[PDB]
Amino acid sequence: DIVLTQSPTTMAASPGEKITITCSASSSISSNYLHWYQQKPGFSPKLLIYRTSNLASGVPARFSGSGSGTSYSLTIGTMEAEDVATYYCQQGSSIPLTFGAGTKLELKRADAAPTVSIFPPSSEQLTSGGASVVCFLNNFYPKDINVKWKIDGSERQNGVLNSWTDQDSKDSTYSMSSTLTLTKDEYERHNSYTCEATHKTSTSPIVKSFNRNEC
Amino acid sequence: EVKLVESGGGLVKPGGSLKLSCAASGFTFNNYVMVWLRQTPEKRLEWVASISRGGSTYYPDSVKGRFTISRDNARNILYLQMSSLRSEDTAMYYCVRGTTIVAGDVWGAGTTVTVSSAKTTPPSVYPLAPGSAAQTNSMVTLGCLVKGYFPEPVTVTWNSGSLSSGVHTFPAVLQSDLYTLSSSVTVPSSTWPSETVTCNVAHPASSTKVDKKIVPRDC
């Protein structure tokens, strides 16, 4: 089986930047059978380049592809916002046809601090015996971020589930959700619930909390 | 407007069977090789089956014997019969038109297959409102927590779709065979209490739909 190795795995491009990504085949492919697809978030992949260098239908001129043998590449002449997507190479010369794992291309923007919001368990959830505490960390940039939970001042790691949005198509920011779930029993045995976000944009963590007994 | 439309995907038990359909239009179907691919929850793309115009079929070893691709040139429909399903078969399945250089030049929207012994379970929807002692600061962020459902997907809207912007609806995460997803919405200070804010949560697998109004918290 041909293995297609793409690099880089992820790339952040400034608007207008000339970007090149690569696809290396474990064995020599006839260039006639090396194609690229573009998959925008939320959508199906779409043929972008076929036979190494030919632009598919609807594809802007700033795209190009080149290569031969075991080495192929894809170039975007000037990064545009609408180019944020995962790009896959694929070989059709050998059965089974195989795809590279994809290069995820994202867009650079000015730093933005997260907007942090914390929420106590609803009555409805407490009624059923559970207690989830939610923290939203919204509209931030760059994408790297760390969340720490504390209960009555002590760090809590188990029972935390995190989820990230894809880069926002309108403002190129990232958002995150972090949910700490415990039993109603454990929740009523503590008071202070805190989520602390460490991000490039501040020299101390952003800390939001609530006490179970606030009024 | 060449088009491919996949259907038939859903939840099925390991060891089970399931048939996908892909309806083709806007092109001369019998002239083309047709392909099933799938994309795993990790986003990896994999070849599943190919069928030549005349009905020659090809499979990777991983599905050979278990999956059968067939076509009906009369109705212009491509099928994938899945059997002896495994959890590793969980993926979004795509109907794809192939070309003689083995590029997929037309793809459908996809259909989702989930292979699991976990049972269909409707979601619980909890309102996320700030603590009673939280301090008002221009914009306000609210949310809905959507917990304990299976399988994917769930859809979430605010105000039946009329609260459109300021919304972040997070990817579901699976824990102990149940999904949790959350959604946040941001609106201006005075806009709330005043104007009703509700999240609407559909879970078709369970024929569930529910609305949760977000009310200010009070000690």
The number of residues in chain A equals: 215
Q: Within 10 A of B135 (CB to CB), how many other CB atoms are there?
A: 6
- Please list the residues that pair with B114 across neighbouring strands: B11
User: Both tokens of residue A148?
Assistant: 């720490």
Q: Which domains does chain B have, with CATH numbers?
A: 1-117 (2.60.40.10), 118-218 (2.60.40.10)
- The letter for the amino acid at A197 is A
* Gap from B106 CA to chain A (nearest CA, Å): 7
Q: Classify A144 in phi/psi space as left (phi over 0), alpha (psi -120 to 50) or beta.
A: beta
Tell me the β-bridge partners of B199: B158, B212
Would you call B133 and A50 a contact, using CB atoms and an 8 Å cutoff?
Answer: no
Query: Which method was it determined by?
Result: X-ray
Q: B14 with B117: CB under 8 angstroms?
A: yes
Resolution in A: 1.9
* DSSP, residue by residue, B146-175: EEEEBSS--EEEEGGGTB-SSEEEPPPEEE
Which candidate, B94, B96, B36, B43, places its Cα nearest to that of A101? Answer: B43
Of B47, B107, B169, the CB nearest to A96: B47
Q: For residues A152 and B213, give the distance between their C-alpha atoms in angstroms, rounded to a whole number.
A: 30
Distance CA B140, CA A117 (A): 9
For domain A1-109, which CATH number applies: 3.40.30.10, 2.60.40.10, 3.40.50.360, 3.30.2010.30?
A: 2.60.40.10
Which of A23, A178, A179 to mutate to test binding with chain B, by most B CBs within 10 Å of its CB? A179
- Residue B113, CB-side half-sphere exposure with 13 Å CA sphere: 33
HEC secondary structure over A97-133: CEECCCEEEEECCCCECCEEEEECCCHHHHHHCEEEE
Return the closest-CA partner of residue A136 out of B139, B190, B196, B194. B139
Q: How far apart are CA B98 and CA B47, in angstroms?
A: 12
Q: How far apart are CA B49 and CA B80, in angstroms?
A: 8
Does B124 contact A99 at a Cβ distance shorter than 8 Å?
Answer: no
B186 interaction partners in chain A (CB closer than 8 Å): 115, 138
Which residues of chain A lie closer than 8 angstroms to B173, CB-CB?
Answer: 161-163
Cα torsion B26, B29, B31, B32 to 10°: value is 100
Q: How far is CA B164 from CA A116, B4, B161, in A?
A: 21, 29, 6
State the DSSP H helix or E strand holding residue B104, giving kind and residue range, or none if neither: strand B104-107
Are A113 and A18 a contacting pair, CB within 8 Å? no
The reply to whether domains A1-109 and A110-212 share a CATH topology is yes
Tell me the three state secondary structure of residue B53: coil
Closest among A204, A159, A212, A206 to A181, alpha carbons compared? A159
What DSSP string describes B170-192? Answer: PPPEEETTEEEEEEEEEE-TTTT
Letter for the amino acid at A55? L
Q: In chain A, what is the greatest distance between 2 CA atoms, to the nearest angstrom?
A: 71
Query: A49 with A141: CB under 8 angstroms?
Result: no
Measured distance between the N- and C-terminal CA atoms of chain B, rounded to whole angstroms = 58
Q: Which fold has domain A110-212?
A: Immunoglobulin-like (2.60.40)
Domain positions in chain A are: 1-109, 110-212
> Looking at the partner chain, which of B101, B124, B128 has a beta carbon nearest the beta carbon of A134?
B128
The DSSP secondary structure of A164-202, one letter per residue, reads E----TTT--EEEEEEEEEEHHHHHT--EEEEEEE-TT-
